[PDB]
Design a protein around this nucleic acid. Structure first.
Lengths: 158, 103, 209, 81
RNA sequence: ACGGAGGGGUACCACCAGACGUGGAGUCUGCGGCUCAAUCUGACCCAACGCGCGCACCUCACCAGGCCCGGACGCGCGGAGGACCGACAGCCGGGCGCGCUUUCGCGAUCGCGCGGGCGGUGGUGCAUGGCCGCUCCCAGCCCGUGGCGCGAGCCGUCUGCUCCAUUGCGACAACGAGCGAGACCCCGGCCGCGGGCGCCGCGGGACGGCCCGCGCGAGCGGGAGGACGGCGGGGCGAUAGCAGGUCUGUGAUGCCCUCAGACGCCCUGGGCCGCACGCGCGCUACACUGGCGGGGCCAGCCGGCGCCCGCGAGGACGCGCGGAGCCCCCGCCGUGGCCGGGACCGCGGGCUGGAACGCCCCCGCGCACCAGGAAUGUCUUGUAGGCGCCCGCCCCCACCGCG
């Protein structure tokens, strides 16, 4: 139903305006048609996805996948801050990965000391690179010889 | 006086539609404002067999007609019944670019 | 926030008028053969319709005291059901007739219908084009040119493009059908003007001193 | 890829010997800007410009390593003795 | 041109390594044969067989039957003292002033003969145009001057090294040009500016550029940094040609055949679907890596909803507003042709339409099928495969096709 590029999402008018102005940071993640927008501020360590905490995301098995950067970097920073994510686009898993990308990038922007930002980059990218750099590959078009992009209709010679 | 007027212009080619846009913006800065809204492109699609008889490899044509639409409803009360005319005749008369005005 | 059932009127009020233009192209082509007809255009001004014509010698179509034109205007209006006097017309004149394929091919059709041999007609056309400043012209005449067993013999002079997007800009093509006693004689023309208008052909580089 | 068609080579040679002063052996940016400059050339496209610039860079560093045939680069001054 | 000749190159419509299938069954559809009044026809290796864009009427050509002339325009004759055209009753008739036993009307818009038209999904695609297909998922093709040969012809246009590429380097009785290839156009991915009902307009960026190895050279191998690294997916598509397909797409057409008991046009029915048989593209399954019941949840080409009846499919009113399968969680079944599979048949309720033979829903019955012989097809990253959702044709209907 949701479309990702909608203006109602990128600005996150969901939040009320007096509260919309306390959020300093902004961030983006993506994977396939999925897009996630994060509004990071100052708090005491709370995260939300579509008005749902991080412990109760639904595929269940990937909860570790979204909690990864915390147990990597450490909980100190996140405990310092508080976040409110919102995602919209194709697929459960795509949404998972977009969300984790947004987490990581946003916490990267919270620090102002570039040196620490680079150190954290090295610390984190080594474990994985898709936590910072978006995956580029995307669904590809089909052709009229058959019912697939590269597969063809079966041919009968005799 | 004030008549909440709106300007809609439609075209099939993207080069005049953007040229008409600039002329209008130039000529409507005074009679109020005239900032544009770019709509999603309506693309008409037609797939046809390339053959009139149905022989050989099944090969297909893929035509389409993109239609571009822009909408300046910014006149609003800033234009009177005659004031709309002023600019609409001062803008260039490109041969093809449908225009309709409504309050 | 918006309804898609309303703008369909704007979109369908453009399509109809694009179609209305094509019928006119066909009708003029079947009519103003002798006036160097080439093309048409339209402007759906609400009060009245305007049509712009491109003709070698408009005075023929203009008609003494603008009679043929006016006879035409009242006619179209009935068919498209507009109040006449709101269906006015204007005519514009082509000055580089050699760069226009339609004029050339129509002239060729005339010359053929007078029994002259193909070998002269084609090369006269091609000389006319080159004099106009062109980089190539190709002529083709397929059909029962001899007793039987129809064959195509093609004449050319310069250099021509045949593929790519640039063929939709610098290459001008047209065709006709000629009905004769033996049968039908297919004829087609194509002309190449690389320095047309202001656009620059790609893969074309000019250097300085 | 590696498709260096005739046009690229001929053009690069021609713009090189007339601009040895305004170019450098390894830069791609300054060479690109010079080719974009109108006094020297007119490249109707972008990708063409980039390719031409790259070939110019290779040509000029080849020169600096040693003379190249087909390029009249004013070297008569060193060998006129 | 060919070679069961040699030498160099290349490609999943070729192979190696592997994957997923077909040929096994039931069924949808098309193709030959049988039958019939008709079961209308084109196409037959690649390069015919869900293809000539959904056949109850039309579409429609074929079978059994009937109205109408909508016979232009010229010459001769006739005609208002009446040319041609309509109708009640009552039958014959599927039906109709179609015909019939009769008598009312209408009014030159003409009747007959002679010439001449119009029209025709009628024949010839081996008389033609145009459009496609194939040669070709190719890399090749030619001009001016000059030179060699009586000449057909040759050199240019390469027996070297590279390239996906006649792509290039470097030479040569050749010199100098051009087409094709690339360049080009659309889409996508990263960044910037502007505008903004609705994310959409203009630009930047990547170039074998940097480093290292080689190589005279063109260029090859590795490592980086980077959104992306070395033709990312599509469009266009050379010269020459085929007795390839299309006269049933057309106010595209030559020559034939039909032209008032019509092959014209309009109506009523039937048929194109009929079935001892051979085979082409697909769909559904053969189960536990599963079936049933309940719940939670996310898309994109793009997109319409409330209330009340009814088990449901559907229906009456009234307004402008809006998105799923696989998957995940909890339970039942427990290797049994079983709750796997859902063909066939027997009662019933509705929708489209002038008209069901068509399509939906409910209870019962519960066919073949245990992974398929000789044989054979397709495929390298968001790919195969699995899962579903939209448009086209369309009164109703998708196992098809484009996405």
């Amino acid at each position: 139903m949701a479309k990702g590029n909608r203006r109602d999402l990128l600005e996150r008018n969901d939040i009320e305006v007096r509260e919309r102005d306390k959020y300093t940071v902004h961030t983006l993640g993506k994977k396939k048609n999925s897009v996630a927008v994060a509004f990071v501020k100052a708090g005491k360590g709370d995260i939300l996805v579509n008005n749902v905490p991080l412990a109760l995301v639904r595929p269940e098995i990937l909860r570790t996948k979204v909690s990864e950067p915390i147990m990597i970097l450490g909980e100190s920073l996140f405990k310092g801050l508080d976040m409110n994510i919102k995602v919209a686009g194709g697929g459960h898993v795509s949404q998972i990965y977009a969300v984790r990308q947004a987490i990581s990038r946003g916490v990267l922007a919270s620090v102002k000391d570039e040196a620490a930002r680079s150190e954290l980059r090295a610390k984190l990218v080594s474990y994985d690179r898709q936590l910072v750099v978006s995956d580029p590959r995307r669904c590809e078009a089909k052709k009229f010889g058959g019912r697939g992009a590269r597969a063809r209709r079966q041919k009968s010679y005799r | 006086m004030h008549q909440k007027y709106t300007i809609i212009v439609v075209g099939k080619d993207l080069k005049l539609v953007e040229r008409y846009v600039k002329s209008i913006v130039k000529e409507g800065r005074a009679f109020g404002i005239s900032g544009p809204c770019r709509a999603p492109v309506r693309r008409l699609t037609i797939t046809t067999r390339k053959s009139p008889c149905g022989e050989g490899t099944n090969t297909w044509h893929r035509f389409e007609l993109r239609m571009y639409k822009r909408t300046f409803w910014v006149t609003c009360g800033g234009n009177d019944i005659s004031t709309i005319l002023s600019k609409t005749v001062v803008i260039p008369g490109i041969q093809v670019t449908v225009e309709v005005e409504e309050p | 926030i918006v309804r898609r059932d309303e703008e369909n009127v704007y979109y369908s009020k453009y399509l109809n008028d694009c179609i209305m233009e094509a019928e006119l192209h066909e009708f003029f082509s079947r009519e103003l053969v002798d006036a160097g007809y080439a093309s048409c255009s339209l402007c759906r001004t609400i009060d009245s319709i305007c049509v712009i014509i491109q003709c070698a010698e408009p005075e023929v179509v203009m008609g003494d005291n603008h009679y043929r034109l006016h006879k035409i205007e009242y006619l179209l209006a009935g068919r498209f059901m507009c109040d006449p006097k709101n269906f006015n017309i204007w005519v514009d004149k082509i000055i580089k007739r050699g760069l226009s394929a339609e004029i050339m091919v129509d002239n060729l059709r005339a010359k053929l219908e007078e029994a002259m041999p193909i070998r002269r007609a084609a090369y006269s056309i091609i000389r006319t084009a080159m004099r106009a400043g062109a980089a190539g012209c190709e002529v083709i005449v397929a059909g029962k040119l001899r007793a039987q067993r129809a064959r195509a013999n093609k004449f050319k002079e310069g250099c021509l493009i045949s593929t790519g997007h640039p063929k939709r800009i610098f290459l001008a093509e047209a065709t006709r059908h000629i009905k004769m006693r033996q049968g039908v004689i297919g004829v087609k023309v194509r002309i190449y003007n690389p320095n047309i208008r202001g656009a620059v052909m790609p893969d074309k580089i000019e250097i300085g001193a | 890829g590696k498709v260096r068609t005739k046009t690229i080579k001929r053009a690069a040679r021609k713009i090189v010997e007339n601009n040895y002063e305004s170019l450098k052996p390894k830069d791609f940016q300054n060479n690109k800007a010079i080719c974009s400059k109108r006094n020297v050339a007119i490249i109707p496209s972008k990708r063409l410009r980039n390719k031409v610039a790259g070939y110019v860079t290779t040509l000029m560093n080849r020169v600096v390593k040693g003379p190249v045939h087909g390029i009249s680069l004013r070297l008569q001054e060193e060998e006129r003795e």
